[PDB]
Amino acid sequence: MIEIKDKQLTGLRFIDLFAGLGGFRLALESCGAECVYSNEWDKYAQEVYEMNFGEKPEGDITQVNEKTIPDHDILCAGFPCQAFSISGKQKGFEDSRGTLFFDIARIVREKKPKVVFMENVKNFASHDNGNTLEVVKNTMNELDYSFHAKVLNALDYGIPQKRERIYMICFRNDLNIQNFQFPKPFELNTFVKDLLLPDSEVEHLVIDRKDLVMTNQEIEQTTPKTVRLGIVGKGGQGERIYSTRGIAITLSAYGGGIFAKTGGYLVNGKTRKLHPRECARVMGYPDSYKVHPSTSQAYKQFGNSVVINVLQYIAYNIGSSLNFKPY
Ligand SMILES: C[S@@+](CC[C@H](N)C(=O)[O-])C[C@H]1O[C@@H](n2cnc3c(N)ncnc32)[C@H](O)[C@@H]1O
């Protein structure tokens, strides 16, 4: 993550829904905001969340009563995508019933807040011929909110990894805000080689394979692209080797293969996976964020997580718009 010297959010209060590892929390707390709530049911996530943020989030959202949630200015949420079974006249609020989204709407209609800050998968914009996005959109509009959405790729913001994700920002219509804008992309000057740990701490991740077939040889120059160097097995997912002088492929929580979630990399004449500190680093997490003792957990977590840096630029630009109220 990077440091923000202009705390455009001091004094503002927020809730961290579907917490996971606490990305949105790391991000907003650096802009000055304060955390008033958190919710997350996966006992392992709650375990890491507590190791860093000292507290344990509450449980199953489906069961928390709306009128029970603290007063807040910003609602943060990276919920899980699910299809909507639209069975009726046109689209809106009533169709979000049965999904965990309805739980967001349920809390927004009855408690504050100035802005709803969400995030999801790269293809949220296309799911069901656009139907999935059409619903969340019409729902926010009909509760008196404005809707802005965009797909930003993390390599365009100082992080070496291919990872497109839709970011969605909603401003209460009461605020009258025609002033918002998503950050501008820039030059990348950090690649996978700069994020690795020394060999001594990564020996146990080397995988020796005789069916390794090299298609290209190591490039001499770094590029902001994904460079496939070789293969193993059938060359399907999880069995492809990448160059450290490039960008990391998209980390995944539930993938399989020989090099399962991190992908495999040619580091120093040996083929290995990424270590969890590396995974953290590839997501933007600071070296001070204590990770889960179980390396198979760290993987599932960091792959369902958030790119901190991107969250920090978008949040700053939110303090801005809310702080510009001239006579
Ligand atoms: C309250 S239960 C889901 C109940 C759902 N109504 C039902 O029909 O099955 C809470 C859900 O939150 C999901 N969840 C927790 N943290 C999340 C996050 N950061 N992003 C996405 N989904 C998350 C859990 O995996 C679980 O499915």
φ, ψ (nearest 5 deg) of residue 150: -155, 150
In this structure, which residue's CA is closest to atom 2 in ligand 1?
Answer: 60
Q: Give 58's DSSP letter.
A: B
* C-beta of 59 in contact with ligand 1 (< 6 A): no
Which of 35, 81, 170, 279 is catalytic? The answer is: 81
CA distances from 326 to 50, 69, 73, 78 (A): 41, 32, 21, 33
82: CB partners within 8 A, 6+ apart: 99, 100, 101
Task: Write phi, then psi, for 127 (nearest 5 degrees).
Answer: -45, 120
CA 301 – CA 298 distance, rounded (Å): 5
Q: Is 61 in the pocket of ligand 1 (CB under 6 A)?
A: yes
User: What SS3 string covers 129-158?
Assistant: CCHHHHHHHHHHHCCCEEEEEEEEEHHHHC
- Are 209 and 262 in contact by the 8 Å Cβ rule? The answer is no
Domain 1-186+285-327 matches domain 187-284 at the CATH topology level: no
Structure tokens given for 55: 């507290």
d(CA 120, ligand 1 centre) in Å:
13
**Cβ atoms < 10 Å from Cβ of 177:** 19
Whether ligand 1 lies within 6 angstroms of the CB of 101 is answered as no
CA 269 to chain CA mean position, Å: 32
Report DSSP letters for 92-138, one per residue.
SGGGGBTBSSHHHHHHHHTS--SEEEEEEETTTTTTTTTHHHHHHHH
Q: How far is the C-alpha of 308 from the C-alpha of 286, rounded, in Å?
A: 9
What is the side-by-side order of every strand in the sheet holding 164-172? 34-38, 13-17, 74-77, 115-121, 164-172, 145-153
The HSE-up count of residue 154 (CA atoms within 13 Å, CB side) is 28
Ligand 1 in reach of 45 Cβ (< 6 A): no
31 catalytic? Reply is no
- For residues 243 and 260, what is the distance between their CA atoms, to the nearest angstrom? 17
Rounded to 10°, the helix 276-283/295-302 angle is 20
Q: How far apart are CA 205 and CA 279, in angstroms?
A: 13
Protein residue closest via CA to atom 4 of ligand 1: 62
- Residue tagged 């069901």 (tokens): 128
Which residue's C-alpha comes closest to atom 17 of ligand 1? 18
CA distance 323 to 327: 13
For the domain bounded by 187-284, which CATH number is listed?
A: 3.90.120.10
Residue 83's identity, in one-letter code, is A
How would you write 240-306 as a 3-class SS string?
A: EEEECCCCECCCCCCCCCCCCCCCEEECCCCEECCCHHHHHHHHCCCCCCCCCCCHHHHHHHHCCCC
Resolution value, angstrom units: 2.5
Q: 189, 202, 198, 259: which is closest to 229 by C-alpha? A: 259
The experimental method, as deposited, was X-ray
Task: Compute how many other C-beta atoms are within 10 angstroms of the C-beta atom of residue 163.
Answer: 20
Rg (CA), the chain: 21
40 ligand 1 Cβ < 6 A: yes
Name, in order, each residue with C-beta under 8 angstroms of 89's C-beta and a sequence gap of 6 or more: none
Angle, alpha carbons 134-140-175 (nearest 5°): 140
Domain ranges of the chain: 1-186+285-327, 187-284
Architecture of the domain delimited by 1-186+285-327: 3-Layer(aba) Sandwich (3.40)
For residue 60, the ligand 1 atom closest to its alpha carbon is: 1
The residue whose CB lies within 8 Å of the most ligand 1 atoms, and thus the one to mutate among 24, 41, 96, 120, is: 41
| Surface-to-core class of residue 113, CB atoms within 10 Å of its CB (0-12 exposed, 13-18 middle, 19+ buried) | buried
Distance, CA 324 to ligand 1 centroid (Å)?
Answer: 36
Task: Please check whether residue 254 is in contact with residue 301, taking contact to mean a CB–CB distance below 8 angstroms.
Answer: no
Helix (H, G, I), strand (E, B) or coil at 172: strand
Cβ partners under 8 Å of residue 157, min gap 6: 183, 185, 186, 307, 309, 310, 313
Could you give the CA distance from residue 203 to residue 195 in angstroms, rounded to a whole number?
Answer: 16
Ligand 1 centroid from CA 246, angstroms:
35
From residue 325, how far is each of 16, 31, 94 by CA, in Å? 27, 19, 35
